[PDB]
Amino acid sequence: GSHSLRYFHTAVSRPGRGEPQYISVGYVDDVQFQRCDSIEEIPRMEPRAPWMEKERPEYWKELKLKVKNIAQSARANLRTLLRYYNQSEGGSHILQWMVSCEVGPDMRLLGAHYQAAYDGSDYITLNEDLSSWTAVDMVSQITKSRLESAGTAEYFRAYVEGECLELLHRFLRNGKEILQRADPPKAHVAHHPRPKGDVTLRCWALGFYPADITLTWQKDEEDLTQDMELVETRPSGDGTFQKWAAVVVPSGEEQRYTCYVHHEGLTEPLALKWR
C-alpha cells in the first residue's frame, strides 16, 4: 500500500577513537538498505539490501560527496549549538535528525518529514504544511525565525520532489519482491504451569513482515489489556519479526482464553487457543 523512504542521521562532537563523527542509516519501510559514516574525516558506505547491487557507480560517488558535506556541516552546527547554550567544550554532544518521504498506493507523494534533536531532546520539527516549524525553547525559537524568514523549507520541498521520490520509486521497483510483500504471522500458544498452580499462556507470533502487529488476549468477550505481559516487537535477524503476549490464568480454565493476532498480511485477525 503506502511506502516510506527514511534516513536516520547522527552527528557526535567528541567521539571515542574508532567511533564515527557522523553516521546515517537508510530504510525503505522496515528494510535497511545502506549505512554511511565518517570516521576521522574518512567517509564510508555499505549496502545492506540486495537491490542496492543494482545501483550504478555514480550513485555511490554522489553519496560519498553528500556524506563529506553533511559531516562537515553537522560538526559546524554542533560548534554553534554549544555556544548558544553556553555549554562547555570537552564534553560530547549529539545532533540527530530524521528525513523521509512517503507515497500512497498510486506511488504519488503523500507527505514528508524533517525533524532534529539536540542531546536526545526535540529541537525543531518541520510541520505537515512543509513551510512552518515547531520549536521548543528560546534557542530553537531563534532557529525557527531564521528558517522561516529565509524560506529554507522550500529547499527541502525540492529535495523531496526530486531525489527522495526518485530513490523511493527506484528502490520499490528494483526490490519489489522484498518490499511489496506481506508475510503473515505463524502463531501458536505455549503452556507453562507455575508452582502456584496457575498457568502462563504465552501467545507467540513469528516470521511476519512488516513489523507492525497487535497481539491481544480476551476472556470470553472482555479484553485483558491490563492483565497482559508483552515484549516489544523484535527482529529475528532474517528480515522477519517476532513478538509474544502472555496472561496468567487458573488451571483448568485455559480454554476460556483466546489470543487475537492482527497483521496486514491477514484479511481478518487470527484467533487461537491453547491446543
Binding site: 558535506n69 552546527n77 549549538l81 532534529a116 532557529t143 531525489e163
Partner: peptide, 7 residues
Amino acid sequence: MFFINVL
C-alpha cells in the same frame, strides 16, 4: 541525504 543548518 539532506541537512539544514539550524544556527
